[PDB]
Amino acid sequence: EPLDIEAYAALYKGRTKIMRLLFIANHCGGNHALQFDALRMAYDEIKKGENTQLFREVVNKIGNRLGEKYGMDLAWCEAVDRRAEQKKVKLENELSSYRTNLIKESIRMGYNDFGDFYYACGMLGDAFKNYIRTRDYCTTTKHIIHMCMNAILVSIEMGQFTHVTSYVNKAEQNPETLEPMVNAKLRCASGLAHLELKKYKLAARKFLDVNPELGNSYNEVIAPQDIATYGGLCALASFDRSELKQKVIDNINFRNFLELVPDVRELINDFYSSRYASCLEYLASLKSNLLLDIHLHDHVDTLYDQIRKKALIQYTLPFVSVDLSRMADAFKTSVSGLEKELEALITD
Amino acid sequence: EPLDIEAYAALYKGRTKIMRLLFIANHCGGNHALQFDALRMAYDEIKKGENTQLFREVVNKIGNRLGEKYGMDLAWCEAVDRRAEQKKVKLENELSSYRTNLIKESIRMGYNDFGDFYYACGMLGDAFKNYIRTRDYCTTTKHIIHMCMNAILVSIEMGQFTHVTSYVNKAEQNPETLEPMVNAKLRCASGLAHLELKKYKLAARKFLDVNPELGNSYNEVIAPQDIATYGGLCALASFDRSELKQKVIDNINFRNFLELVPDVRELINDFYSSRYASCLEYLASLKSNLLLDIHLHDHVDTLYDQIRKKALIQYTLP
Numbered sequence: 322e323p324l325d326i327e328a329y330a331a332l333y334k335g336r337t338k339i340m341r342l343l344f345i346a347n348h349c350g351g352n353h354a355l356q357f358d359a360l361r362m363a364y365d366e367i368k369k370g371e372n373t374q375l376f377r378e379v380v381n382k383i384g385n386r387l388g389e390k391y392g393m394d395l396a397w398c399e400a401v402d403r404r405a406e407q408k409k410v411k412l413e414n415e416l417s418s419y420r421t422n423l424i425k426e427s428i429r430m431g432y433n434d435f436g437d438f439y440y441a442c443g444m445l446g447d448a449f450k451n452y453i454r455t456r457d458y459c460t461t462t463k464h465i466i467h468m469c470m471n472a473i474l475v476s477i478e479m480g481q482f483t484h485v486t487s488y489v490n491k492a493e494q495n496p497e498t499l500e501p502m503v504n505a506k507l508r509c510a511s512g513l514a515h516l517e518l519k520k521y522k523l524a525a526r527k528f529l530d531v532n533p534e535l536g537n538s539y540n541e542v543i544a545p546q547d548i549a550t551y552g553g554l555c556a557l558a559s560f561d562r563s564e565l566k567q568k569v570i571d572n573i574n575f576r577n578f579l580e581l582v583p584d585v586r587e588l589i590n591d592f593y594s595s596r597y598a599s600c601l602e603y604l605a606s607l608k609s610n611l612l613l614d615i616h617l618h619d620h621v622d623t624l625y626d627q628i629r630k631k632a633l634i635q636y637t638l639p640f641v642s643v644d645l646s647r648m649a650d651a652f653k654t655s656v657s658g659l660e661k662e663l664e665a666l667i668t669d
Numbered sequence: 670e671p672l673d674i675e676a677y678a679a680l681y682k683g684r685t686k687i688m689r690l691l692f693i694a695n696h697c698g699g700n701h702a703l704q705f706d707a708l709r710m711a712y713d714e715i716k717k718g719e720n721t722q723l724f725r726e727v728v729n730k731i732g733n734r735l736g737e738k739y740g741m742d743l744a745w746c747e748a749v750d751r752r753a754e755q756k757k758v759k760l761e762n763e764l765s766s767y768r769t770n771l772i773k774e775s776i777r778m779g780y781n782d783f784g785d786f787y788y789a790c791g792m793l794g795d796a797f798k799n800y801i802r803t804r805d806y807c808t809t810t811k812h813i814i815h816m817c818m819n820a821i822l823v824s825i826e827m828g829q830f831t832h833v834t835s836y837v838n839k840a841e842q843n844p845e846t847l848e849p850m851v852n853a854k855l856r857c858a859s860g861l862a863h864l865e866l867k868k869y870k871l872a873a874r875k876f877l878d879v880n881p882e883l884g885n886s887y888n889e890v891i892a893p894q895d896i897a898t899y900g901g902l903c904a905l906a907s908f909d910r911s912e913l914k915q916k917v918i919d920n921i922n923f924r925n926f927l928e929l930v931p932d933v934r935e936l937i938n939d940f941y942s943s944r945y946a947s948c949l950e951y952l953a954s955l956k957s958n959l960l961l962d963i964h965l966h967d968h969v970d971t972l973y974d975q976i977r978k979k980a981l982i983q984y985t986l987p
Contacts, residue, residue, distance in 0.1 A: 638985060639985065639987050648984060650946070651945045651946055651984060652945060652946070652949065652977075652980070652981070652984075653946055653949050653950075653953075662977075662981055663981070666978070666981060666982065
């Protein structure tokens with residue numbers, strides 16, 4: 322089933338919407354309607370919008386192929402550039418005045434405004450730095466959590482998930498009870514970080530416990546559809562049958578995410594029911610779209626491989642809950658190594 | 670357990686002692702204590718020695734790294750080479766006379782002496798040719814067996830195990846029944862060739878049937894220790910548990926050999942008794958010295974895989 326990026330793009334809010342558009346355009350492609358659709362959608366989102374270099378990049382990517390409206394605009398670039406100079410100088414002015422006047426909240430907000438500014442104009446390190454500089458000036462829990470959330474966001478945008486894990490840890494270890502929405506977003510970030518660091522078991526454990534009510538709240542990061550897909554796939558590639566039963570099949574909250582992706586739902590059910598062929602057919606049909614996913618793309622093959630292995634082993638052998646770690650320990654390997662050996666045996 | 674080349678080398682007799690020290694010094698290395706002790710011993714042995722080709726080889730390999738008494742010796746080389754030439758000429762004259770006078774047994778012995786001479790000089794193909802050549806001069810079954818034993822030894826040193834097999838066959842099929850020790854040695858040769866030809870099951874059967882009274886009498890080729898090691902690992906990689914119980918765990922004669930190498934004995938018991946991690950720990954621990962084994966080296970990984978595979982399957986029994 323083919324992807325419609327109108328509906329997909331609509332799921333997302335900020336820079337990530339743009340990045341996902343560019344990602345789709347860049348690779349899978351070979352299907353160029355999709356490509357230049359994505360390029361066009363991206364062009365119009367970027368134009369909105371504070372970021373001149375991204376505009377230039379997409380303009381060079383489209384390359385006049387879409388006509389006059391999708392070509393280069395010098396007016397726009399110059400204007401945006403100058404207004405940036407202006408509001409920048411205004412910023413630094415105000416902050417010098419605040420630091421000097423010794424007003425805590427205004428210094429925090431000053432730095433934060435700077436972060437907003439560089440994030441917007443697209444310079445990510447400077448935004449991170451400035452967001453992080455607000456620690457000392459935080460009066461309230463809300464301020465600290467706000468700092469962590471921004472640092473998480475920009476870390477993600479720059480691809481440091483180690484950092485994301487750090488700032489999740491920072492915010493989470495705050496002794497104060499947090500709004501459950503905030504916790505939902507924290508669990509999302511940790512899950513995503515784990516996914517991108519290839520710790521799938523941990524990824525899945527995080528996603529499966531995300532608050533059902535999250536909906537689109539975390540839109541500038543993730544969509545409920547992603548939570549179901551990543552949670553489901555990671556679980557299937559990681560969990561033994563017991564844990565799959567406890568934290569997926571019988572997890573009523575997670576059903577709300579699953580209902581959003583019935584293919585993934587049926588596929589997981591197929592697997593738990595030991596219909597392995599059906600499961601694998603479904604994954605085959607899903608492979609293209611999954612390959613279109615900025616976050617999941619690098620993990621598609623590993624996860625598919627893992628699920629196929631677990632399938633082979635369950636199907637062919639004298640364990641349904643397969644005590645694989647017991648054997649791994651008997652053979653002085655990891656479970657994934659053992660899985661390689663076993664697949665060799667089972668298939669020849 | 671870290672290898673001591675002294676004990677190991679002391680186990681063997683002729684050319685093979687040397688070939689072993691050289692094989693050792695050539696691979697594992699990273700351990701240059703090992704390398705240097707091996708080179709030194711090789712040099713010392715080779716020097717005893719009719720083979721200046723070997724000598725120049727080890728001199729080059731060492732490259733003056735053992736200092737002044739481990740390098741080139743021109744006087745030694747000259748003396749050895751000259752003595753050889755004198756010898757060769759004497760042997761040529763004799764054999765020529767024997768051929769001229771039609772003296773069967775002298776012709777036979779003549780070609781045989783050339784065989785010996787060539788072997789000492791390090792020229793293996795020539796040696797092989799003369800030893801085989803004695804075939805046309807054989808009056809007796811002993812003669813046949815003598816030629817076979819020489820042919821076998823030289824083929825092993827030339828690493829041609831197809832020939833080893835031939836001369837093993839010839840020997841084995843003697844209408845006359847063979848002496849026990851010759852039989853034992855032949856089992857050893859056959860096992861060796863099977864091992865090189867990557868047929869481990871046959872190799873194992875051969876080695877497992879070797880008469881425990883052979884001891885060090887085959888030292889030019891194999892040691893009792895090697896018989897245990899090759900027998901054990903080959904069987905373990907090859908045999909079903911029935912055969913492994915019968916021919917190995919319950920084989921009392923072979924127990925004599927297995928005694929000599931406890932780690933391998935225990936490795937086999939651990940495998941049989943299905944304590945897998947123990948087994949693989951032993952294999953892990955032996956892997957280095959097995960890789961130093963001039964004959965077993967190439968087979969190590971394969972045998973290891975085979976063993977491991979079997980273990981996995983054993984594990985899946987309910």
